[PDB]
Amino acid sequence: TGDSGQKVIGVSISNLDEFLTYMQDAMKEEAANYPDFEFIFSDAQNDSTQQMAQVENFISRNVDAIIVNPVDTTSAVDIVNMVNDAGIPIIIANRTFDGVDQATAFVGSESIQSGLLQMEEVAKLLNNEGNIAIMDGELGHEAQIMRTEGNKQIIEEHDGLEVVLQGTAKFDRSEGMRLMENWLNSGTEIDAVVANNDEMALGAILALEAVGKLDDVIVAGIDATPAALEAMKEGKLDVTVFQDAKGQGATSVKVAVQAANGEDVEDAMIPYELVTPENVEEYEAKY
Ligand SMILES: O[C@H]1[C@H](O)[C@@H](O)[C@H](O)[C@@H](O)[C@H]1O
Ligand SMILES: [Cl-]
Ligand SMILES: [Mg+2]
Ligand SMILES: [Mg+2]
Numbered sequence: 001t002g003d004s005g006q007k008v009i010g011v012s013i014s015n016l017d018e019f020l021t022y023m024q025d026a027m028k029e030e031a032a033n034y035p036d037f038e039f040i041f042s043d044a045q046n047d048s049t050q051q052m053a054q055v056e057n058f059i060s061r062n063v064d065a066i067i068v069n070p071v072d073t074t075s076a077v078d079i080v081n082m083v084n085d086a087g088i089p090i091i092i093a094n095r096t097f098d099g100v101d102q103a104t105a106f107v108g109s110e111s112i113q114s115g116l117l118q119m120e121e122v123a124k125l126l127n128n129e130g131n132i133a134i135m136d137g138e139l140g141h142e143a144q145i146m147r148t149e150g151n152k153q154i155i156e157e158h159d160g161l162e163v164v165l166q167g168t169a170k171f172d173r174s175e176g177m178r179l180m181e182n183w184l185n186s187g188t189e190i191d192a193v194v195a196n197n198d199e200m201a202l203g204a205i206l207a208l209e210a211v212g213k214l215d216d217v218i219v220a221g222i223d224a225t226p227a228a229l230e231a232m233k234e235g236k237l238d239v240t241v242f243q244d245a246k247g248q249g250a251t252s253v254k255v256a257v258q259a260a261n262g263e264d265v266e267d268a269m270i271p272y273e274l275v276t277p278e279n280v281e282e283y284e285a286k287y
């Protein structure tokens, strides 16, 4: 090696939402294993201009690697272009975008797989017959587009399955509750509420509980957060899909360190796993 300077990794997470908080905690835990590195853990607070300013700062500091969880798929491209031009490795964590193969590596999970797994199980529970209400996450996130696409690919496989409602609750619990309330007030018949993440599903459950209709509707989410697993244990949540926050966070740090140390790195695609009341205790154990 040509020097003995402390190395530095700059991290910009989109925000600290329910799932991403677990990922960030896992990044911080893994980062503690590398005493020859300093880490800068920054939070973009869902603001792409702030994320761009964080990345520009990392470039100007000449950090040894950058980890980004992109706020949106448009600015993601500008970020990767800029960091590539700077000659600094850039690891993309958890959120992908069109153009991701220009980054140094991607660490995350394949979104359409979670929508396919989720809706396959809901279809089984419905015996392939039912009116489906889909809760989109944050519009234009790849996870939103592709979880819903996976849902629809299963729905299109079965003539008795039909999407009757589709709206966004912005990956948010309170918005999920409001959306469910509005859907209930529309009088539309719903057999399953299928949400792009667990927070929205948990919001829908609160609304369904409030009018005594939770036993009449199948509810599904994605992430298998501890909150979701508790709802499943209580018999409120029928389906979720484990996304490995700890694995994504620890692996992103490991890959960034490798790249910072001058090694070529590669993607890490961590599988999604179906969670049902039959295997829920196995996923509690992951926390
Ligand atoms: O910020 C979102 C949010 O945490 C979702 O709940 C999770 O499924 C997505 O992977 C993540 O990008
Ligand atoms: Cl949240
Ligand atoms: Mg030297
Ligand atoms: Mg590559």
Ligand SMILES: [Mg+2]
Binding pocket: 214, 215, 216, 217, 218, 219, 236, 238
């Ligand atoms: Mg129910």
Ligand code: NA
Binding pocket: 155, 156, 157, 158, 159, 160, 161, 162
């Ligand atoms: Na159909």
